[PDB]
Enzyme design. Structure first.
Site, PDB file in Angstrom:
ATOM      1  N   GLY A 147       0.953  -1.167  -0.279  1.00 35.83           N
ATOM      2  CA  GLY A 147      -0.247  -0.521  -0.026  1.00 35.83           C
ATOM      3  C   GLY A 147       0.827   0.947  -0.136  1.00 35.83           C
ATOM      4  O   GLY A 147       2.207   1.150   0.180  1.00 35.83           O
TER       5      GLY A 147
ATOM      6  N   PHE B 210       3.543   9.806   2.185  1.00 36.25           N
ATOM      7  CA  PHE B 210       4.603  10.460   2.972  1.00 36.25           C
ATOM      8  C   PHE B 210       5.225   8.750   2.719  1.00 36.25           C
ATOM      9  O   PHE B 210       6.070   8.508   3.329  1.00 36.25           O
ATOM     10  CB  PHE B 210       4.095  10.794   4.283  1.00 36.25           C
ATOM     11  N   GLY B 211       3.829   8.558   3.200  1.00 36.73           N
ATOM     12  CA  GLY B 211       4.185   6.428   3.414  1.00 36.73           C
ATOM     13  C   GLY B 211       3.762   5.210   2.601  1.00 36.73           C
ATOM     14  O   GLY B 211       3.023   5.354   1.872  1.00 36.73           O
ATOM     15  N   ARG B 212       4.640   4.219   2.980  1.00 35.19           N
ATOM     16  CA  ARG B 212       4.311   2.994   1.985  1.00 35.19           C
ATOM     17  C   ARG B 212       4.145   1.881   3.380  1.00 35.19           C
ATOM     18  O   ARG B 212       4.615   1.940   4.242  1.00 35.19           O
ATOM     19  CB  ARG B 212       5.470   2.892   0.770  1.00 35.19           C
ATOM     20  CG  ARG B 212       5.350   3.936  -0.379  1.00 35.19           C
ATOM     21  CD  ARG B 212       6.392   2.884  -0.658  1.00 35.19           C
ATOM     22  NE  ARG B 212       7.936   4.196  -0.223  1.00 35.19           N
ATOM     23  CZ  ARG B 212       9.375   3.401  -0.723  1.00 35.19           C
ATOM     24  NH1 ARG B 212       9.296   2.618  -1.443  1.00 35.19           N
ATOM     25  NH2 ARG B 212       9.885   4.274  -0.010  1.00 35.19           N
TER      26      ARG B 212
ATOM     27  N   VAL C 236      -0.090  -9.132   8.095  1.00 33.60           N
ATOM     28  CA  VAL C 236      -1.311  -9.469   8.571  1.00 33.60           C
ATOM     29  C   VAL C 236      -1.989 -10.256   6.759  1.00 33.60           C
ATOM     30  O   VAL C 236      -1.817  -9.511   6.146  1.00 33.60           O
ATOM     31  CB  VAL C 236      -3.107  -8.909   9.314  1.00 33.60           C
ATOM     32  CG1 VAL C 236      -4.102  -9.452   8.868  1.00 33.60           C
ATOM     33  CG2 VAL C 236      -2.446  -8.682  10.982  1.00 33.60           C
TER      34      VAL C 236
ATOM     35  N   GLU D 292      -7.752  -5.904   3.954  1.00 35.19           N
ATOM     36  CA  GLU D 292      -8.288  -4.940   4.449  1.00 35.19           C
ATOM     37  C   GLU D 292      -9.809  -5.749   4.481  1.00 35.19           C
ATOM     38  O   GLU D 292     -10.252  -6.345   3.452  1.00 35.19           O
ATOM     39  CB  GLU D 292      -7.690  -3.695   4.102  1.00 35.19           C
ATOM     40  CG  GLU D 292      -6.424  -3.587   3.580  1.00 35.19           C
ATOM     41  CD  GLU D 292      -6.642  -1.658   2.425  1.00 35.19           C
ATOM     42  OE1 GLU D 292      -7.687  -1.085   1.895  1.00 35.19           O
ATOM     43  OE2 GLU D 292      -5.522  -1.296   2.942  1.00 35.19           O
TER      44      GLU D 292
ATOM     45  N   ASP E 284      -9.493   7.358  13.581  1.00 36.18           N
ATOM     46  CA  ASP E 284      -9.415   6.989  11.481  1.00 36.18           C
ATOM     47  C   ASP E 284     -10.177   5.904  11.580  1.00 36.18           C
ATOM     48  O   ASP E 284      -9.453   5.185  10.205  1.00 36.18           O
ATOM     49  CB  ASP E 284      -7.832   6.342  11.393  1.00 36.18           C
ATOM     50  CG  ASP E 284      -7.243   6.723   9.528  1.00 36.18           C
ATOM     51  OD1 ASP E 284      -8.579   7.225   9.340  1.00 36.18           O
ATOM     52  OD2 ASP E 284      -6.261   7.003   9.315  1.00 36.18           O
TER      53      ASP E 284
ATOM     54  N   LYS F  37     -12.493   3.085   9.631  1.00 31.25           N
ATOM     55  CA  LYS F  37     -12.434   2.638   8.171  1.00 31.25           C
ATOM     56  C   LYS F  37     -12.193   1.156   7.656  1.00 31.25           C
ATOM     57  O   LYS F  37     -11.325   0.861   8.609  1.00 31.25           O
ATOM     58  CB  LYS F  37     -11.902   3.967   7.392  1.00 31.25           C
ATOM     59  CG  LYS F  37     -10.963   3.706   7.590  1.00 31.25           C
ATOM     60  CD  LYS F  37     -10.176   5.034   6.469  1.00 31.25           C
ATOM     61  CE  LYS F  37      -8.440   5.179   6.173  1.00 31.25           C
ATOM     62  NZ  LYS F  37      -8.217   6.466   5.172  1.00 31.25           N
ATOM     63  N   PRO F  38     -12.974   1.528   7.129  1.00 30.76           N
ATOM     64  CA  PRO F  38     -12.691  -0.249   6.278  1.00 30.76           C
ATOM     65  C   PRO F  38     -10.894  -1.025   6.308  1.00 30.76           C
ATOM     66  O   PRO F  38     -11.006  -2.177   6.061  1.00 30.76           O
ATOM     67  CB  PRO F  38     -13.943  -1.207   5.462  1.00 30.76           C
ATOM     68  CG  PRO F  38     -14.903  -0.124   5.386  1.00 30.76           C
ATOM     69  CD  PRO F  38     -14.127   1.090   5.990  1.00 30.76           C
TER      70      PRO F  38
ATOM     71  N   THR G 250     -10.794  11.175   8.134  1.00 31.42           N
ATOM     72  CA  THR G 250     -11.332  10.813   6.163  1.00 31.42           C
ATOM     73  C   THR G 250     -12.328  11.035   6.194  1.00 31.42           C
ATOM     74  O   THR G 250     -13.077  11.006   7.206  1.00 31.42           O
ATOM     75  CB  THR G 250     -11.992   9.081   5.904  1.00 31.42           C
ATOM     76  OG1 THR G 250     -10.001   8.985   6.694  1.00 31.42           O
ATOM     77  CG2 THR G 250     -11.724   8.902   4.750  1.00 31.42           C
TER      78      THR G 250
HETATM   79  C1  LIG Z   1      -0.021  -5.789  10.196  1.00 27.81           C
HETATM   80  O1  LIG Z   1      -0.108  -4.390   8.884  1.00 27.81           O
HETATM   81  C2  LIG Z   1       0.013  -5.529   8.060  1.00 27.81           C
HETATM   82  O2  LIG Z   1       0.165  -6.357   7.669  1.00 27.81           O
HETATM   83  C3  LIG Z   1      -0.597  -4.127   6.792  1.00 27.81           C
HETATM   84  C4  LIG Z   1      -0.729  -5.075   5.887  1.00 27.81           C
HETATM   85  C5  LIG Z   1      -0.853  -3.435   4.651  1.00 27.81           C
HETATM   86  C6  LIG Z   1      -1.368  -2.634   4.992  1.00 27.81           C
HETATM   87  N1  LIG Z   1      -1.925  -1.324   4.386  1.00 27.81           N
HETATM   88  C7  LIG Z   1      -2.093  -0.275   5.323  1.00 27.81           C
HETATM   89  C8  LIG Z   1      -2.456   1.210   4.495  1.00 27.81           C
HETATM   90  C9  LIG Z   1      -3.418   0.995   3.520  1.00 27.81           C
HETATM   91  C10 LIG Z   1      -4.976   1.060   4.351  1.00 27.81           C
HETATM   92  N2  LIG Z   1      -4.105   1.914   5.619  1.00 27.81           N
HETATM   93  C11 LIG Z   1      -3.201   1.786   5.595  1.00 27.81           C
HETATM   94  N3  LIG Z   1      -1.731  -0.570   6.316  1.00 27.81           N
HETATM   95  C12 LIG Z   1      -1.380  -1.860   6.180  1.00 27.81           C
HETATM   96  C13 LIG Z   1      -0.704  -2.821   7.753  1.00 27.81           C
END
Ligand SMILES: COC(=O)c1ccc2[nH]c([C@H]3CCNC3)nc2c1
Ligand SMILES: COC(=O)c1ccc2[nH]c([C@H]3CCNC3)nc2c1
Length: 337
Positions: free
Chosen positions: A39, A41-43, A110, A114, A153, A155-156, A188
């Site tokens: 996914g 400022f950040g990835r 995980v 999502e 924050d 949201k699904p 959001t």
């Molecule tokens: C333990 O975390 C994970 O396994 C994990 C995986 C994909 C992810 N994509 C995002 C973005 C998109 C939704 N908002 C933040 N956070 C994530 C966290």
């Protein structure tokens, strides 16, 4: 019941010990192999630890972009909170560190994806399915609020579905320790409570409003307030005029009217009985709160995936470098990270 009171008192004790003495610098980048961007400022990138073979989700924040987007305090909140919490439905921070360019938060991966993906694939969740997820959020907010944390924050997209079909909440970038009110415009648009939109001093009641938006979105397949422009969403929110699909049960509509209450002083979760007005509502009559906490309820849905490194429940993004400058950037601003 005293058993819940003693649980939350112990939970706050353990949180405060880590809050007052945060861990720092517990790995480095070349301890990991980069696998895929999950996914962006950040990835967030899937990585594998080179010695143990374990998989992690590594959130990478560019320090210069954090500063420019005025997110320094928020980023420091996120890591300080994540390293201090412990609850069955929260992501687990295993490592954090920084280098010349970036901040890194390395969380247990995980693989189920999502909630948003599954919701859009299925269309809408049945009320029992939505209720299973909602109960986990109610318990998680009871925990966070007892620690004086607002989440801000919901949201699904921020609710990951694990190998057992349970939720792990991710993204604490707007979470904050707050006794009393706070004032930052963040969140959001579709999920913002009216008092955030109106620039008021607001409190943990905004999380309960967001729970109402989430339950509506899970059970309907779309959120209660939407429009092509945020200003139009905001006008609908502050009217709070909500239309319910005819397939909603009467109990569901009644709970949602009390969560999506524009007057924060009348909103469920923010009355004298706190979270128990929600837990004791008729819509939750079939919920075994203890069994949910203990993860003993069979989940309505198990994500399909092949193993702990499977990325098929996440989508595809352009793969960009993780650059680390030869020179330290913004060292002072992020001293405590
Ligand atoms: C333990 O975390 C994970 O396994 C994990 C995986 C994909 C992810 N994509 C995002 C973005 C998109 C939704 N908002 C933040 N956070 C994530 C966290
Ligand atoms: C229609 O239908 C519709 C319109 C706007 C929407 N905005 C979102 C976000 C809210 C958080 N998850 C997805 N879903 C939407 C659905």
């Amino acid at each position: 019941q005293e058993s819940v009171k003693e649980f939350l008192a112990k939970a706050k004790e353990e949180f405060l010990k880590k809050w007052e003495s945060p861990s720092q610098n517990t790995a480095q980048l070349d301890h990991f192999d980069r696998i895929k961007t999950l996914g962006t400022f950040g990835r967030v990138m899937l990585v594998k630890h080179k010695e143990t073979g374990n998989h992690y989700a590594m959130k990478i924040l560019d320090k210069q972009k954090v500063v420019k987007l005025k997110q320094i305090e928020h980023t420091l909140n996120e890591k300080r909170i994540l390293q201090a919490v412990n609850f069955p439905f929260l992501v687990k921070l295993e490592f954090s560190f920084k280098d010349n360019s970036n901040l890194y938060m390395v969380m247990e991966y995980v693989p189920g994806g999502e909630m948003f993906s599954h919701l859009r694939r299925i269309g809408r969740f049945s009320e029992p399915h939505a209720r299973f997820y909602a109960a986990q959020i109610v318990l998680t907010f009871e925990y966070l609020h007892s620690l004086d944390l607002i989440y801000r924050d919901l949201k699904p997209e921020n609710l990951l579905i694990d190998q057992q079909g349970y939720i792990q909440v991710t993204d604490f970038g707007f979470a904050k320790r707050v006794k009393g009110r706070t004032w930052t415009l963040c969140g959001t648009p579709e999920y913002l409570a009216p008092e955030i939109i109106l620039s008021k001093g607001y409190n943990k009641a905004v999380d309960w409003w967001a729970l109402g938006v989430l339950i509506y979105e899970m059970a309907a397949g779309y959120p209660p307030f939407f429009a092509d422009q945020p200003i139009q969403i905001y006008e609908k929110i502050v009217s709070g005029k909500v239309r319910f699909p005819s397939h909603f049960s009467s109990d569901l509509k009644d709970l949602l009217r009390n969560l999506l209450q524009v007057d924060l002083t009348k909103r469920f979760g923010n009355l004298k009985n706190g979270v128990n007005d929600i837990k004791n509502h008729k819509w939750f009559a079939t919920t075994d709160w203890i069994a949910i906490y203990q993860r003993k309820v069979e989940a309505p849905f198990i994500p399909k995936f092949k193993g702990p490194g499977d990325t098929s429940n996440f989508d595809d993004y352009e793969e960009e470098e993780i650059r680390v400058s030869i020179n330290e950037k913004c060292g002072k601003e992020f001293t405590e990270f």
